[PDB]
């Protein structure tokens, strides 16, 4: 088991959409890496300058739309890929 530190999130990126909206199969760069993924683990929370730690607004098991970049790191646990990214890199959360 892996859990983050401070304002960091462990997310499992969802599989890229093989087929398009109308049933057209997309391959190569067409099926680009998905920017939404379910949250696997939430850190303790962001640390403020005064010394208080506030919990992250994201929750474990909620799909989040995140941004790729230097902030996100692709680690491997049990031959599986997990993205470690700061909560700021999480643009949105997917509900319903």
């Amino acid at each position: 088991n892996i859990r983050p530190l401070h304002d960091r999130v462990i997310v499992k990126r969802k599989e890229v959409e093989t087929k398009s909206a109308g049933g057209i199969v997309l391959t190569g760069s067409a099926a680009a890496k998905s920017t939404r993924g379910e949250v696997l683990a939430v850190g303790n929370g962001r640390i403020l300058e005064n010394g208080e730690v506030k919990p992250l607004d994201v929750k474990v098991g909620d799909i989040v739309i995140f941004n790729d970049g230097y902030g996100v790191k692709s680690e491997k646990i049990d031959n599986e890929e997990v993205l470690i990214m700061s909560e700021s890199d999480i643009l949105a959360i997917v509900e319903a």
Partner: protein, 183 residues
Amino acid sequence: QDELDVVEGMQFDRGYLSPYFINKPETGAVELESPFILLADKKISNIREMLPVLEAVAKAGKPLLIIAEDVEGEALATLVVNTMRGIVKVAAVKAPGFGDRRKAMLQDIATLTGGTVISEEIGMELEKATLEDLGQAKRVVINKDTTTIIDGVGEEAAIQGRVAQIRQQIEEATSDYDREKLQ
């Protein structure tokens, strides 16, 4: 012995862009029955331009033949994969000729097949292309060398008007090669 080879309708010498389009492996020739025809003046390499066209064609169910300056890379990969998967029967062949000629004979194919050419200069875009924009033909046969359209569904008056225009270009032409190409 002397032989005579007569080909009618459109038989411009452009083969399939990928061998995997072949519906009939025994003859090595792609065969489409009453397919749509998309005509693009621009060369394409991505897929995002023709999800509307491809999805609407798959919804219609009729096959699709693509005439374009060049289809390559991810576009060919996507069309080929969809061809095996059977969602849409797509065959993409290069537009014939070169500059100031490819546009002319693409407009000719559009008139013969009752379609409209997709181009930047004309104004419309591939993303906004629809079924009524796409051309129609009774039959299409593709080989390694030649592409043939049989009984293109197009208005007779438009065909006569276009051939009249080509005749006027013949009259105004002053080079033997030019008038031979126009004929």
